[PDB]
């Protein structure tokens, strides 16, 4: 579903885990960690992930930021290369939406500071998604990350 959209400098600086998407991408990919550095108003970074075909891998990335849109470019796989709009941004999480080749009709992505986001964060994420006409129950999550015992 297309949202109804509503970025300070340096807000994506740091380590993030991409644990939730709509539609779900986590049958094709897992364990996505990102590290972003700020370069004035842009970012350059590393993503690491597990791939069924490549195993544990890394990508160099550039975020070229232009108001509320940005263009994500990766070095060696172009399937997630797109303009992304920021839907929500917080201390603990950020949400963006784009239309890469992997998901031409729309891909929403939630990145979190924590590896296993708790109820404190998940309640904010849900309210955030409702303010932009999306709904958390249509998101899939990274069920290969162990976040609970048994
Ligand atoms: C998951 O990602 C981290 C890198 O953030 C890595 O250290 C670890 O090996 C990975 N686990 C699996 C099972 O891929
Ligand atoms: C893309 O960039 C990363 C990080 O610098 C590098 O480790 C990775 O292997 C590159 N991919 C290829 C196919 O060269
Ligand atoms: C996946 O979802 C459930 C709740 O929907 C949560 O308890 C679990 O930790 C989540 N996995 C993540 C975010 O890694």
Numbering used by the authors: 1 to 6, 11 to 154
From the paper:
The principal component of this milk is lipocalin-like proteins or Lili-Mips. Lili-Mip has a lipocalin fold and binds to different fatty acids and other moieties.
The intrinsic tryptophan fluorescence change was employed to determine the binding affinity of different fatty acids to Lili-Mip1. Fatty acids of varying chain lengths (14, 16, and 18) and degrees of unsaturation (0, 1, and 2) were assayed. All tested fatty acids bound with micromolar range affinities to the different Lili-Mips. The data showed that Lili-Mip1 had no change in binding affinity for palmitic acid between pH 4.8 and 8.2(KD’s at pH 4.8, 7.2, and 8.2 for Palmitic acid are 1.76± 0.93; 0.44±0.20; 2.24±0.11 μM respectively). Deglycosylated Lili-Mip1 showed a marginal decrease in stability. However, the removal of glycans did not affect the pH-dependent change in the thermal stability of Lili-Mip1. In various crystal structures (reported here and previously by us), Phe-98 and Phe-100 occupy multiple conformations in the binding pocket.
